[PDB]
Structure formats: structure tokens, C-alpha cells
Design a protein around this ligand. Structure first.
Ligand code: RET
Ligand code: CL
Length: 208
């Protein structure tokens, strides 16, 4: 099982999700198409061997971080619509999200230990993002129908629990202490990407 095989698997999974969401679809459905559609492209590019950047003694996958930077704010946007956020609360959480994603991208691309300083900053901003999901956004979602509130809580917990695993996979993998091997590290992230995007989406379809 090679890296390319794992990338192709993620590509196929994202594509199936993309077509499923497009068929079922307006704002929510269009967002889900963007979430998995963008990831599909990133995985194909990586499957073709494009964007594998050598850094010191590790290999960094640049399309992964471009993907995350564009798709994770769309996931937060989806959750913000469910919770009924005003346009100002959106700005805070999307700003916090972007800090996490940019810090990870920069830390991965830096060869020296300064990269752990960048990782720490993303961790701090992530804790602030979790606070907004579990607190203010949950208060806000409470004002909606019982079924919408229930859907928000289920997507929120899926999101919080799984997103919290990524920093550990990153740190234990090549970008960090380089303990886990690239193949295992990639396999774990392909699984998480598929669940936090396509699984996320199908839980929404089921409730609709
Ligand atoms: C579809 C892709 C998803 C949901 C990716 C999620 C990624 C994260 C939650 C990553 C978080 C990170 C930290 C909290 C600290 C810095 C390193 C990251 C980017 C792995
Ligand atoms: Cl990476």
C-alpha cells in the first residue's frame, strides 16, 4: 500500500460525496459540494505526485494545507448557519479557524524548531475555536427548532472530537517528532478527512 494508493482512495471518497451532495441539492447543499469538491481536487493532485515538497528530512504535502484552509471555514460556516449566527460572530470563528490552518501550514514548511512555536500558536487558537463551538454557538443554536438544535449538536460533537485528533496526528507524524511513518500518518488523515467532510455531509442529508 503506497502513498499514491491512499491519495487515490481519498480522491474517490471525496468524489462520491461530492456527487451525492450535488444530487441531493440551496446554501447548505452548495457548501457541502465545496467542502468535498475542493478536497477531491487536492487528493487527485497529491495522488499524481504534485505538491510533495521536501523540507529538511521530511516530505510535506502542500495541497493538503490549501485544502484545509479553504474547506475548514466552510465547515464552520455550515455550523454557523445551523446555529443562526449574526454576521459578526461568523467573523470571529472564521478568523480563529484561519489562524489554526495558517499556523499549521507555516509550521509544516519551516525546517527548524521554530515550527513548534507555530504549532503552539495554532493550538492556542484552536482552543478558542472550541470554546465558541461549545459555548456561544450552542447558546445561539438553542433559539432554533428542536430538530435544528439536535442536528447542530450532533455535527458539533462530531466536529469537536475529530478535529481535536488532527494536532496529535500532525505532532506524532513527519511534521513533528517524525515518530509515525508517512504511510501510517497519511492513512490516518485520509480517514479523518473523509469522516469530517463526507461523513459530516451524510449526517446532514439524513436529517434533511
Ligand atoms: C477537512 C479537513 C479537516 C476537518 C481538517 C482539520 C484539521 C485540523 C483541526 C488541524 C488542526 C491543527 C492544530 C489544532 C494545530 C496546528 C496543526 C493543525 C493544523 C494540524
Ligand atoms: Cl503534511
Amino acid at each position: 500500500v503506497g502513498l499514491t494508493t491512499l491519495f487515490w482512495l481519498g480522491a474517490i471518497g471525496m468524489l462520491v460525496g461530492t456527487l451525492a451532495f450535488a444530487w441531493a441539492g440551496r446554501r447548505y447543499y452548495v457548501t457541502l459540494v465545496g467542502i468535498s469538491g475542493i478536497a477531491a481536487v487536492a487528493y487527485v493532485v497529491m495522488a499524481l505526485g504534485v505538491g510533495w515538497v521536501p523540507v529538511a528530512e521530511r516530505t510535506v504535502f502542500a495541497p493538503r494545507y490549501i485544502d484545509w484552509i479553504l474547506t475548514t471555514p466552510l465547515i464552520v460556516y455550515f455550523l454557523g448557519l445551523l446555529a443562526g449566527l449574526d454576521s459578526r460572530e461568523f467573523g470571529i470563528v472564521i478568523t480563529l479557524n484561519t489562524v489554526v490552518m495558517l499556523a499549521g501550514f507555516a509550521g509544516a514548511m519551516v525546517p527548524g524548531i521554530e515550527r513548534y512555536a507555530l504549532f503552539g500558536m495554532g493550538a492556542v487558537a484552536f482552543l478558542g475555536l472550541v470554546y465558541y463551538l461549545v459555548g456561544p454557538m450552542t447558546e445561539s443554536a438553542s433559539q432554533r427548532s428542536s430538530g435544528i438544535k439536535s442536528l447542530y449538536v450532533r455535527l458539533r460533537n462530531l466536529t469537536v472530537i475529530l478535529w481535536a485528533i488532527y494536532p496529535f496526528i500532525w505532532l506524532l507524524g513527519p511534521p513533528g517528532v517524525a515518530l509515525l511513518t508517512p504511510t501510517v500518518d497519511v492513512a490516518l488523515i485520509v480517514y479523518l478527512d473523509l469522516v469530517t467532510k463526507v461523513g459530516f455531509g451524510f449526517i446532514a442529508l439524513d436529517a434533511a
